[PDB]
């Protein structure tokens, strides 16, 4: 409710889950998905925790999570929208 993902973000999460399941296992995949669900709730309950990245796109914020990086836009005081969950294909560009 305080956070919602896009179809692309859900597809990315499914890709990562299937990858970690085919490599490690099913319980591993469950632990990994519980971790990002916790990260989702954390970004919702605290949207100023992700470093701002207006340079890349105006309004977006990014948060590191293992080998991937969640991109999300703040849509409320404690509401955020997760748009993409990519890998390390990202750039700082300060």
């Amino acid at each position: 409710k305080p956070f919602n993902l896009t179809v692309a973000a859900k597809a990315d999460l499914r890709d990562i889950a299937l990858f970690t399941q085919r490599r490690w296992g099913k319980e591993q995949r469950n632990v990994y998905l519980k971790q990002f669900d916790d990260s989702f709730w954390l970004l919702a309950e605290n949207p100023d925790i992700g470093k701002s990245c207006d340079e890349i796109r105006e309004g977006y914020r990014k948060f590191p999570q293992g080998s991937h990086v969640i991109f999300y836009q703040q849509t409320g005081s404690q509401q955020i929208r997760v748009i993409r969950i990519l890998h390390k294909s990202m750039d700082v560009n300060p």
């Binding site: 919602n4 993902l5 896009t6 179809v7 692309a8 973000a9 859900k10 999460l13 499914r14 889950a17 299937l18 399941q21 099913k26 995949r29 469950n30 998905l33 519980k34 669900d37 890349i56 796109r57 977006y60 991109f71 836009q73 929208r81 748009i83 993409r84 990519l86 294909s89 990202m90 750039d91 560009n93």
Partner: protein, 73 residues
């Protein structure tokens, strides 16, 4: 021509002396290749964000997502 400074001019000389780069044009071209690759990477990340944001909001719940993934296999 252009003016870079004692830092980069010194750098270019040390890179040429190392034998890894023949000409100063060569080392400047390698740097420009790096910058162009990073620009293409930036634009690719931007188009990924665009195609992600102009897609629909998806109905997400952790346990429902896990149940769906279990029903797949």
């Amino acid at each position: 021509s252009i003016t870079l400074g004692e830092h980069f001019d010194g750098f270019i000389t040390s890179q040429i002396q190392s034998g890894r780069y023949g000409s100063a044009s060569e080392v400047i071209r390698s740097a420009l290749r790096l910058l162009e690759n990073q620009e293409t990477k930036l634009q690719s990340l931007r188009q990924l964000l665009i195609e992600g944001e102009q897609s629909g909001d998806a109905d997400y719940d952790l346990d429902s997502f896990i149940n769906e993934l279990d029903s797949e296999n």
